[PDB]
From a paper:
Iron homeostasis is regulated by the hormone hepcidin; BMP6/hemojuvelin–mediated (BMP6/HJV-mediated) signaling induces hepatic hepcidin expression via SMAD1/5, with transmembrane serine protease 6 (TMPRSS6) being a negative regulator of HJV. Individuals with loss-of-function mutations in the TMPRSS6 gene show increased circulating hepcidin and iron-refractory iron-deficiency anemia, suggesting that blocking TMPRSS6 may be a viable strategy to elevate hepcidin levels in β-thalassemia. We generated a human mAb (REGN7999) that inhibits TMPRSS6.
We therefore explored whether inhibition of TMPRSS6 by using a mAb that binds to the serine-protease domain and prevents cleaving of HJV would be an effective way of reducing iron overloading. We found that REGN7999 does not appear to directly occlude the catalytic triad and likely inhibits TMPRSS6 activity allosterically by binding the LDLRA2-domain and part of the catalytic domain. REGN7999 binds to several different forms of TMPRSS6 and blunts its activity in vitro. We assessed the ability of REGN7999 to block TMPRSS6-mediated cleavage and release of HJV from the cell membrane. Cells treated with aprotinin (a protease inhibitor used as a positive control) or REGN7999 had high staining for HJV, showing that aprotinin and REGN7999 prevent cleavage of HJV. The IC50 ranged from 4.10 to 6.92 nM dependent on species and variant, while the isotype control Ab showed little to no inhibition of TMPRSS6 cleavage activity.
Numbering used by the authors:
A (entry chain B): 1 to 220
B (entry chain A): 82 to 572, 581 to 754, 757 to 811
C (entry chain C): 1 to 135, 142 to 221
D (entry chain L): 1 to 214
E (entry chain H): 1 to 138, 145 to 224
Write the structure that this text describes.
């Protein structure tokens, strides 16, 4: 068992400057019999299968560009990205194969910094089919915004509700490096028909003032 | 409850002549002839008492000579009468119906167009499954006739068709012989061969499943003059997977009559007709042999075949052998067998071989000879179960109950006669007396009677001195133990010529096995290296001689190609038994200092337990890693076979030996690697091949190797 | 080229057993090692088992030693994994990995799409689909709700259009069900001209539901 | 670690008889067992190793067998130069541990011991101690028990017994038991007896003596 | 013909030191592991210590761990055993035994060639003269004499300077708790010769140069 540590846990890099990822083992990776270091660097893309970037600490695969350079000594290993593009987004792993059982590393996220983006806010009321199910769902949607921090909240008849809404945010984008967020809110029949208005308000750095979107119950 | 019975038959017509257009079903003339024949058959069936149960008739094929219509018919009859409507009864009824109308002045509607011979009508039973099998194969179909002395080559099959049938017809008085040859390396087609006109399961001569490497030729005989061949499931599309030839063969009697001479040697062979072709389904062989005296019994040595007892009602598939009114049935097994027949009152011996059922196996060949009744094995031990002469008191159990190794004087040790004290074999005839009054070094030069660990010179003489082969001094009158002693002379990491006989067997640039050069053109190895799927092809492999470093080429090494590859016939994959294989080189080796063959031990060579030998094999230095870049030698100590027999519990055979490594650690031993051991004369003798083992990391387990002295006979037979 | 297709997976009782298998093509199968690599839904990669070119050196992981068994069949060109004694930790997504050399300790070369193995006490359910339309450019979508277990495949026009499609990860509700929504952004000129519909595929429930979205 | 044991602890056979000796370790070792043939006064001799292999020069009357935990040494026919002490050792792993040992005597007819008593002398009485001896002569086999009875009481720990070797003429035994006391312990007791129990007699014969008259 | 000759046994105080030497002959000393086997008088064999083919590693028992020390000199073909901090339980006969292999890493490690043995006795008491006392009772009768409180061994007992040798019995000496030996000699004679023929037993001790002729009578 060789415990592998990676540093830093996360790193935001804008396109243009190099980046460095460090992997530290618990032993030394030198098979004495051949003098070959048994460390490999893999990249897991968002929602795809992991790829192979570097094998034996120096060599690259048949499709990896020159922007990746592996190096190291004994216990301390470094992967360097010369110029960071918008596609090198994902989690990076370092794996050793000098003893059984092989152990994958810990992971290191990569985030691409860009300019400030204004989210697009939409309100999606419950459909007619879900009214007979006994529960109604209304969803607030934001998309195409940077940076990631943005606080979404609901207002039902000028009242604040907590502990009853669920938010989900996708991963980083490949071409423009943005985010999309969806906040769903479910109410019972005893609560939905007893209210009239429903509003969604968001606080984000890209807007000077918190914008709101509201709708009436029974206007369409 | 109405049940449908199926009858398939052939009817001969003398008023019609066969034509080539009838061979193609798509021809209009063939369709018209089929319609007319079906109408005539329906009228004939309805004319008899079976017309009340007639269901549907269809003419299937036409034959050469007089117009022979092969058709099938169905009868919907009550179940209670099903046992009454036997095929013989139906044939008799049809014959009576045909014969009654001949004398009558009334003319049958079918008789106005077709004149049928009553003697030519043949009817056989069939099943609904047989109907479906025939009725799905109504596509790919050809008919042909084979003349006397003429060999016919097939017409190529159509890959589109999923099931093709050849209907072969020859002379009435001649048998049909069919030859199958395997062109492709491995293939997944299915073939079936039947003795009748249609694919009737009860008349199946033989079914070939798979597509093997061991034997390329399949020769099948048919009892009758007609034959059917059905090919199915060409799964992966290609062309020409196999080749059929066919020819007519005369029938001759295999029964013979001979008188044995005065000898103890195998005087001849007894074989089924047309060996090694599959014997005819209705064969019958009778052999009469006369022994010269009542003091000699008869020995029959089989090859991959054996006899055993049976219960009288049971019909045995393999075949029936009757020996002096004793009945026996064969059992094809991968071990040698010998049947020993004593003589008490009559010098004549009678041996009968009969085929009991329709299914036929491959031909049988047995060597016959004489043996003195008393002490049948001279200087050997006779294992009772399988009647073979096995060595006695050599430390190896060679009989299932182990009666050869029991209650004898000095097991694997020499016996002084002056005072009955066991002394070690290397102390016998060495040059200093060790028996108290000099018996050990007596009669060292003259001829002796053979026993255990007695090297037998070429003139069937014996030698007292143990391990006299290749020791730089003549030891028998013949002088055959110093001829061809050019091997075994040398020129942790091995050096540049420390082990000149080591060879690497590689395919696609990677080392799968190692081997030991035993002759100028032969390389021995283990069989389990070729167990894999794609690796069995001879073209793939390449052999490297005189190399120590896998990484980079060095001046010494030479590379050859494998010409032939022979596995041991009795090799068993599941038990690793008989794990040995031979590879023939492209051209012979030039004996430089880098490459030299290893010395093959004799059948009576003594490998002493507790001796140290060396395993020179490439191996993965660490668990799960690549093979080491340097050839690594490691020493092991031989173990008595009793010990590892107790270790492995019914899993170690007389063909294996056991060696142990250094305690507390290694296990890396390669596959097919040698286990050479040094002799007192400075020459290395190849004592085994790396076969298998359990426990890399178990504290006290041994490695099991192919005992070469147990397979030396086959090696010498193949090499010479 | 190199193709690896996994099969098996699905829902397993916590204590039952399963067998999964790969399906390799595009290369000489008996030359290289084969590995199984499982990834937790929110954790990193983890090795499971590996086998050499001819099952000569089988080696397992530490947490799954004695419970799993890896094997291969060079004839059918296939890899099998017998997994037994399942626990609520063993739920993951499994990848069939083709190594770079003939030994277990060579670099991983090719990765398969992987199959999801989940374990839970609850049984399967059917996804409920609802269309969602609002009432420059606008957005429109459809959500699936109350389905178990993973996964569900939501597409638009059977995969015709793929620009502006956003699918959110499944969220585990308090009850124990999952729900997500797929949305497409379109200019407001073709709302009442071209009809928009989405199809959902659910293998554990074996349902293909088509729903047209409109206000 | 391993604790070897053998059975029987003693034997008695005649020329031409077949003898069997058993050796059982406490846990199996892989049957790396060895047998030794110590004569009464000489160095041990190796007969059999690996539990079946035989050493060069050993007569072909010794056979080794067994496996697992149980091993056996077989003497097919006895010989005059064959009565000795046989030890089994296990030669695999490091506390090498021999067996207790088996003695093989020469079988003969049962003989009844002759029992004699001897009072302490006056020279011994003037030194400060006391020594009373009882002698058993010309008996067979060795298995015989001796007890010291004073005033009908049993002693323990103050008596020492010694036996001779098997005679070369008639193959018999002689035993002598000595009881040592002090003058104070000798003065306050009246009667002394050396009780003998042996299978050669139907009843244990007694021998008692007093002082002051003899 | 292989031989192993030993030397170095003798009287040692309970706490002193001793060194035994074993000289080999007939074989190659530098290719076999050796061992020392001790046997307390009247008891079974007991392993003591062992040494590999060429000084590579030494092995000991439990009851002699830290006290004894085995060593090997391949130049003069000799095996040495240095003992110190001796006790009263280390008196025994020592044998120099040879193994079948170079070391103990393999499976064949039996003892085949042995030495004659040297007697190492450890005691606190010094030499003293044998005390010879008569032994007579108060058919056939039996007389004798008892030898008590003598050190060290051995002592020779005869009857009539060899004139009487039919019916003699000299039992082995027994070691008492006081560290001094004692034995007896008994001769069976017919009862009719008691009053007619006299008997003298002769006791001879070499280390204490003592000769005692004791008359035995009723
Ligand atoms: C075999 O296939 C043939 C068609 O080629 C079937 O033959 C017909 O069988 C029906 C039975 O109801 C008769 O009425 C027809 O006259 C037959 N036609 C010919 C051309 O012979 C036959 O039924 C199929 N076999 C089976 C078992 O179903
Ligand atoms: C084999 O043929 C020989 C003759 O060729 C037969 O042997 C004869 O046996 C009869 C017994 O009635 C003797 O009277 C003859 O003298 C024999 N003739 C010869 C030439 O030896 C023998 O019987 C034949 N085999 C069988 C089974 O009948
Ligand atoms: C071995 O086969 C021969 C024929 O080759 C048998 O001889 C026949 O025996 C029967 C007995 O029922 C006679 O009716 C025949 O006339 C014999 N024929 C000939 C040609 O001799 C012989 O019986 C067979 N032996 C056994 C034991 O079955
Ligand atoms: C033949 O028999 C079958 C089954 O009994 C029946 O269904 C069918 O009608 C019959 N056909 C003719 C042509 O009589
Ligand atoms: C057959 O063997 C016996 C016993 O071995 C022998 O006496 C006899 O001479 C042998 N007979 C012949 C003909 O060789
Ligand atoms: C051999 O040994 C002894 C010693 O010389 C001799 O007396 C005896 O007779 C000989 N024995 C034989 C069988 O020749
Ligand atoms: Ca044998
Ligand atoms: Ca000799
Ligand atoms: Ca010779």
């Amino acid at each position: 068992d060789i415990v592998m540590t990676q540093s830093p846990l996360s790193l935001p890099v804008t396109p243009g400057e190099p980046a460095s990822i460090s992997c530290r083992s618990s032993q030394s990776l030198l098979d004495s019999d051949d003098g070959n270091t048994y460390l490999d660097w893999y990249l897991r893309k968002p929602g795809q299968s992991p790829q192979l970037l570097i094998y034996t600490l120096s060599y690259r695969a048949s499709g990896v560009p020159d922007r990746f350079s592996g190096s190291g000594s004994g216990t301390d290993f470094t992967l360097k990205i010369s110029r960071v593009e918008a596609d090198d987004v994902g989690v990076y792993y370092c794996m050793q194969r000098i003893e059984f059982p092989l152990t994958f590393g810990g992971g290191t996220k990569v985030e691409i910094k860009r300019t400030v983006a204004a989210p697009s806010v939409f309100i999606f009321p419950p459909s007619d089919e879900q009214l007979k199910s006994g529960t109604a769902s209304v969803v607030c949607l934001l998309n195409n915004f940077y940076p990631r921090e943005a606080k979404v909240q609901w207002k039902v008849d000028n009242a604040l509700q907590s502990g009853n809404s669920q938010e989900s945010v996708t991963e980083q984008d490949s071409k423009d490096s943005t985010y999309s967020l969806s906040s769903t809110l479910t109410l019972s029949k005893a609560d939905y028909e007893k209210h009239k208005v429903y509003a969604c308000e968001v606080t984000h750095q890209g807007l000077s003032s918190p914008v709101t979107k509201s709708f009436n119950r029974g206007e369409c | 409850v109405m049940v449908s019975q199926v009858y398939s038959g052939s009817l001969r017509v003398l008023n019609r002549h066969f034509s080539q257009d009838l061979t193609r079903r798509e021809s209009s003339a063939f369709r018209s002839e089929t319609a007319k024949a079906q109408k005539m058959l329906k009228e004939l069936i309805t004319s008899t008492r079976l017309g009340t149960y007639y269901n549907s008739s269809s003419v299937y094929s036409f034959g050469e000579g007089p117009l022979t219509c092969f058709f099938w018919f169905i009868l919907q009859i009550p179940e209670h009468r099903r046992l009454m409507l036997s095929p013989e009864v139906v044939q008799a009824l049809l014959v009576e119906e045909l014969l009654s109308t001949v004398n009558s002045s009334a003319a049958v509607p079918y008789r106005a167009e077709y004149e049928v011979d009553p003697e030519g009508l043949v009817i056989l039973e069939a099943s609904v499954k047989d109907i479906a099998a025939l009725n799905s194969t109504l596509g790919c179909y050809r008919y042909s006739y084979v003349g006397q002395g003429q060999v016919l080559r097939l017409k190529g099959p159509d890959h589109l068709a999923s099931s093709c049938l050849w209907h072969l017809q020859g002379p009435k008085d001649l048998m049909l012989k069919l030859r199958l040859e395997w062109t492709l390396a491995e293939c997944r087609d299915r073939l079936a061969m039947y003795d009748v006109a249609g694919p009737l399961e009860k008349r199946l001569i033989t079914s070939v499943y798979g597509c093997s490497r061991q034997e390329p030729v399949v020769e099948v005989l048919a009892s009758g003059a007609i034959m059917a061949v059905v090919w199915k499931k060409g799964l992966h599309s290609y062309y020409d997977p196999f080749v059929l030839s066919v020819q007519p063969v005369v029938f001759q009697a295999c029964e013979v009559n001979l008188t044995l001479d005065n000898r103890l040697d195998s005087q001849g062979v007894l074989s089924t007709p047309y060996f090694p072709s599959y014997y005819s389904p209705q064969t019958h062989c009778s052999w009469h042999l006369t022994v010269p005296s009542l003091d000699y019994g008869l020995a029959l040595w089989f090859d991959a075949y054996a006899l055993r007892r049976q219960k009288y009602d049971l019909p045995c598939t393999q075949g029936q052998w009757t020996i002096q009114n004793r009945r026996l049935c064969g059992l094809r097994i991968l071990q040698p067998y010998a049947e020993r027949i004593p003589v008490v009152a009559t010098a004549g011996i009678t041996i009968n071989f009969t085929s009991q059922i329709s299914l036929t196996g491959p031909g049988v060949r047995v060597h016959y000879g004489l043996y003195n009744q008393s002490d049948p094995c001279p200087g050997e031990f006779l294992c009772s179960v399988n009647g073979l002469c096995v060595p006695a008191c050599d430390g190896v159990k060679d009989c299932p109950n182990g009666l050869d190794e029991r209650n004898c004087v000095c097991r694997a040790t020499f016996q002084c006669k002056e005072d009955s004290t066991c002394i070690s074999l290397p102390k016998v005839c060495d040059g200093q007396p060790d028996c108290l009054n000099g018996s050990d070094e007596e009669q060292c030069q003259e001829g002796v009677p053979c026993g255990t660990f007695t090297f037998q010179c070429e003139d069937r003489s014996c030698v007292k001195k143990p391990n006299p082969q290749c020791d730089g001094r003549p030891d028998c009158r013949d002088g055959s133990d110093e001829e061809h002693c050019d091997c075994g002379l040398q020129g942790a990491v091995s050096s540049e010529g420390e082990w000149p006989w080591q060879a690497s067997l590689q395919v696609r640039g990677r080392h799968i096995c190692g081997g030991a050069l035993i002759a100028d053109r032969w390389v021995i190895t283990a069989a389990h290296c070729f167990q894999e799927d794609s690796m069995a092809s001879t073209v793939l492999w390449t052999v490297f001689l005189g190399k120590v470093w896998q990484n980079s080429r060095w001046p010494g090494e030479v590379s050859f190609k494998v010409s032939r590859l022979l596995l041991h016939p009795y090799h068993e994959e599941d038990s690793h038994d008989y794990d040995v294989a031979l590879l023939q080189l492209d051209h012979p080796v030039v004996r430089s200092a880098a490459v030299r063959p290893v010395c093959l031990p004799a059948r009576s060579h003594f490998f002493e337990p507790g001796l140290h030998c060396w395993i020179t094999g490439w191996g993965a230095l660490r668990e799960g890693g690549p093979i080491s870049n340097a050839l690594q030698k490691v020493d092991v100590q031989l173990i008595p076979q009793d010990l590892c027999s107790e270790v492995y519990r019914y899993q170690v055979t007389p063909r294996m030996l056991c060696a142990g490594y250094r305690k507390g650690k290694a296990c890396q031993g390669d596959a097919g690697g040698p286990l050479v051991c040094k002799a007192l004369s400075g020459r290395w003798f190849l004592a085994g091949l790396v076969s298998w083992g359990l426990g890399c990391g178990r504290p006290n387990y041994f490695g099991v190797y192919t005992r070469i002295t147990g397979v030396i006979s086959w090696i010498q037979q193949v090499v010479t | 080229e190199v193709q690896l297709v996994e099969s098996g997976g699905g829902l397993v009782k916590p204590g039952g057993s399963l067998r999964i298998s790969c399906a390799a093509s595009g290369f000489i199968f008996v030359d290289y090692a084969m590995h199984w690599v499982r990834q937790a839904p929110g954790k990193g990669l983890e090795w499971v088992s590996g086998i050499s070119w001819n099952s000569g050196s089988i080696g397992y992981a530490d947490s799954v030693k004695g419970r799993f068994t890896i094997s291969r069949d060079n004839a059918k060109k296939s890899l099998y994994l017998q997994m037994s004694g399942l626990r609520p930790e063993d739920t993951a997504l499994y990848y069939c990995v083709k190594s770079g050399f003939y030994y277990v300790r060579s670099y991983f070369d090719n990765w398969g799409q992987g199959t999801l193995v989940t374990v839970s006490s609850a049984s399967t359910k059917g996804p409920s689909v609802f269309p969602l339309a609002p009432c420059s450019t606008a957005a429109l979508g459809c959500l699936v709700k109350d389905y178990f277990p993973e996964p569900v495949t939501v597409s638009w026009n059977s995969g015709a259009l793929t620009s502006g499609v956003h699918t959110f990860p499944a969220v585990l509700q308090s009850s124990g069900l999952y729900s997500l929504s797929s949305v497409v952004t379109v200019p407001s000129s073709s709302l009442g001209t071209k009809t928009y519909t989405c199809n959902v595929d659910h293998k554990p429930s074996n349902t293909k539901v088509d729903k047209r979205v409109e206000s």
